[PDB]
Amino acid sequence: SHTDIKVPDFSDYRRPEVLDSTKSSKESSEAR
Amino acid sequence: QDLEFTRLPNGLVIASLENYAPASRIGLFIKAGSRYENSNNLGTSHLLRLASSLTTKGASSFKITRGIEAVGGKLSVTSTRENMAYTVECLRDDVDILMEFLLNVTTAPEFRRWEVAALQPQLRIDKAVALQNPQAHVIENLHAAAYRNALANSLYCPDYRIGKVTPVELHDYVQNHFTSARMALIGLGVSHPVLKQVAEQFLNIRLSGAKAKYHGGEIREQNGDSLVHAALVAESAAIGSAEANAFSVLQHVLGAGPHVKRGSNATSSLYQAVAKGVHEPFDVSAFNASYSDSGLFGFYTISQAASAGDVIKAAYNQVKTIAQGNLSNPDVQAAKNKLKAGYLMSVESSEGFLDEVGSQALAAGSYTPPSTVLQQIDAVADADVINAAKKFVSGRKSMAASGNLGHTPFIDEL
Amino acid sequence: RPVVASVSLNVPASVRY
Amino acid sequence: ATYAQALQSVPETQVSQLDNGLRVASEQSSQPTCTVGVWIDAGSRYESEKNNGAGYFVEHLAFKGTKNRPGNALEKEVESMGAHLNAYSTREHTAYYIKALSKDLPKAVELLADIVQNCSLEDSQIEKERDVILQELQENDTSMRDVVFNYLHATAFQGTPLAQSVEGPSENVRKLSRADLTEYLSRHYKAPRMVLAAAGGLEHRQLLDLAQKHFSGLSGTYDEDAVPTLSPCRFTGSQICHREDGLPLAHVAIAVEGPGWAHPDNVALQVANAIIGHYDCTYGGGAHLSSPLASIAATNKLCQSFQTFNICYADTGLLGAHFVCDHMSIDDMMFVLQGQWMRLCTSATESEVLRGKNLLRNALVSHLDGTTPVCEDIGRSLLTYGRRIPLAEWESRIAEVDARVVREVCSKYFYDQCPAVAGFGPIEQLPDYNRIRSGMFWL
Amino acid sequence: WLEGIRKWYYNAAGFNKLGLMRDDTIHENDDVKEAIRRLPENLYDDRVFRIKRALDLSMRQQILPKEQWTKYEEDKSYLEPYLKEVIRERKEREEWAK
């Protein structure tokens, strides 16, 4: 159902600054 | 702090309870429910329930809606087949404003021609949101089937009536039912002389209703829903009578509603009685309704199509056993602990508290504190608890149901 | 259950039971 | 009397601690009723994909069997006592609690030890609930609102545990074991990351003895590397859409990164949402309302309902809105919504501020009309902020807020940011993400 | 003396020579469209027909006979209550905004 849904991983496409899911945004956002 | 409680020559109750709370609060409970609507003026209270925020003499529909939102209050309208509350809220620093907004609603509504016209088709939405919740046309037909004249008038308005209401058909109503003899300028979070000032200056002003003649009848609604709903009732008694307090405990004896989240409702005699034989979804509980003139008692159904009879014939048989003496005392004293709780828990909140301080003030004329009630629950008899159900079983029956009704029986097949 | 109406100026209109 | 005098007269809450780690607090008040619970730090954010949905699955079996009160006995000692019993999970916190009378309290707290610690989790029940769970995922498909947030949290927090649901996917629920429950249970229910609270009719020392009586045997420690701390959950700007033209209406949501719990500008943002507010097809104000977003939607009948919010998690949150409208009117609403944020970040009229300030006061107060709302705020405060906040402290923080702060705050968290968008329904008109962002900055 | 002039101007404007009244000829704007929406049926249709014939006679450049003309004492100000009601709300809506 709507819980079985899942988002794929665009880590083949992202910027390097954000690949680390453990980190946060907002420290490279202003640069991005 | 304790509860003042007074009365003017005009018959206008007051109350006040300066709890030193930050949040002030006011209620103005009034007897103008749907029951005082005759055959011609049906659904008028439904419109009048929305007629708040409209033009007045002291201010416009615009000034009200902005002045309130600035201070941060509310303007809610609870209403029943008996009563018609104009509740509010605010911060106590700004009561003297919001009071002025209020009585201009009631004491000086213009009810202009055109603002009504915009306001009528709102009903088709209001009436529609409710019936997403299918109870409130099941339950209406009971009063439509059971009672005849006054209490049969649904809160909500029939369709065809919309587009056709007249303003004169409000002025006549207001000048006949918003009357200082049958009102109650309740308060809370606020001092007593303040209210005594305002009422004598604005509410110092001057019909009746017929009685709920029970009939006994059944209405049916084959409306394609996937489930079934049904209610089966019989003549109850009004409030104040100690005969009431036998039903209100017999409620929890029989079916109370879930006290445990996601619970099997073990102690409910009725729901447990269904659980044998039945192995599919269902739910069921007691229905107690106690108006000033009269009331109803019974139970409310939730089941699949084929299994309407196989559920209702558990309730009816069960309650017969409750009428044939088969009963214990701890069930009652257990059931009282429920009833003794829900009353207190209901009046936990200032609002639910406020719902009870004045609802007594209109039918009765005195505030019964909680303690004095809990005595009336302790002084109940296990020969009244019985019946009671003997009145239910032997009594004439009214019924209604909604959903698929291909396997749902009438009364007589019970 | 003994259903009761409620509308408002700012509280969502509802059906107590 | 007055307002500022009032909050001083409020009962100042009381706090205590136990040697295992179980914080305790309460609040005396003249209500004969009361309510007590166990507001803890455990949910889906701690679950991984293999134990996902655990924090909800436990919630059905706690009240369905223990070691010293098996079967329906626990369910019977409440009804017979005449109290209500209740629970609810979240993605971080969790809570069990009771609504009961004052004199019958010493029996209530006894049970929660029999529940939290001594849940037996019999297999005959585990299989039943394993079907009941698969009955409610079917239901929440119809709770269209909650589908959106489950999509919203799933996107902006993609890749983290936080994108998980609460009940878990249907797959894991058909694969979850007693040991995963036992292992999940045996780690998070620990005194240092738990709380007890209650208020209404009691005294704080009627209670401290009772957790010293019953909960003193709790596991107040752990194997040194067993109790993890948090990962900073990042934020994504991403869109998700479940295109479904066959349905009546389209539930939609947008939001951005929230600051977090501790960050004080939440007192700013709650005002701004209050400035915008809410509306759903029943308020008699109509055009004469004050919030421009409402009077428009009443005037032009663009929508049927919408609400703002402010969700706040550990070191982030979610700020945005949810709205419901016919398919021919989505794009019009979004322009208006975005128009207001830019208006607030730029031109926040002081006269419009005092509204939201005065609106917020009558939320927190009127929210705290009873005992159960209080006992949520306690048991939630002792795991989010730490100290409970006396309401005369919120009030001072608010009166600091003027129109200069808002124009700084909304600039920080709205303007030009990377929002997250959700959609479920006939969204044929829902604009692309780029058009949303281009509409984020005025000029 | 004044009032001998209002009665004269009202005869020179022409719009008594076309079965019309005074409120009929007003410039239509948002403030006025409100009022004309707010009128009752019995009077509203009575606005329509006064116009609907004056047009057809400003077509021909003909007029009504002297008898059917309008009379100054009968120049009913039927619209003024409904209008000033509005601009009250307008200035209440503006000054409340300041």
What does this structure look like?
This is part of a larger assembly, with chains A (32 residues), B (414 residues), C (17 residues), D (443 residues) and E (98 residues). By secondary structure, chain A is largely without helices or strands. Chain A is 0% helix and 0% strand. Chain B has a five-stranded mixed sheet, with helices on both faces. In chain B, strands 1-2-7-4 form a four-stranded mixed sheet, sandwiched between helices. By secondary structure, chain C is an all-beta fold. Chain C is elongated, with a radius of gyration of 8 Å. Chains in contact: A-D, B-C, B-D, B-E, C-D. Chains B and D meet through helix 2, strand 6, helix 5 and helix 12 of B and helix 1, helix 3, strand 4, strand 5 and helix 13 of D. Strand 5 of chain B pairs antiparallel with strand 1 of chain C, so a sheet runs across the interface. Chain B: Pfam families: Peptidase_M16, Peptidase_M16_C. Chain B: It is found in: Mitochondrion inner membrane.
Keywords:
part of a larger assembly; 5 chains; B: 414 residues; alpha+beta; D: 443 residues; Cytochrome Bc1 Complex, Chain A, domain 1; 2 domains; 7-stranded mixed sheet; 13 strands; globular; membrane protein; Cryo-EM; Inhibitor binding; cytochrome bc1
Helix content of chain D: 40-55%
Terminal CA distance of chain A: 35 Å
Main sheet properties of chain D = 7 strands, mixed
The count of helical stretches of chain A stands at: 0
C-alpha-based Rg of chain D, rounded: 23 Å
Query: At the fourth CATH level, what is the homologous superfamily of the largest domain in chain D?
Result: Metalloenzyme, LuxS/M16 peptidase-like
Assembly state: part of a larger assembly
User: Helical region count of chain D?
Assistant: 17
Overall 3D shape of chain A? elongated
Approximately how much helix is present in the residues of chain A?
Answer: under 10%
How would you sum up the major sheet of chain A? none
How many distinct beta strands of chain D?
13
Named CATH topology of the largest domain in chain D = Cytochrome Bc1 Complex, Chain A, domain 1
The chain pair forming the largest interface, with residue counts per chain, is: B-D, 57 and 53 residues
Q: Which series of helices and strands of chain D comes N to C?
A: HEEEHHEEHHHHHEHEEHEHEEEHHHHHEH
Domain unit count of chain D? 2
As a percent range, the share of strand residues of chain D is: 15-25%
Top-tier CATH class of the largest domain in chain D: Alpha Beta
Radius of gyration of chain A: 13 Å
Q: Which structural class do you get from the secondary structure elements of chain D?
A: alpha+beta
The assigned structural class of chain A equals: little secondary structure
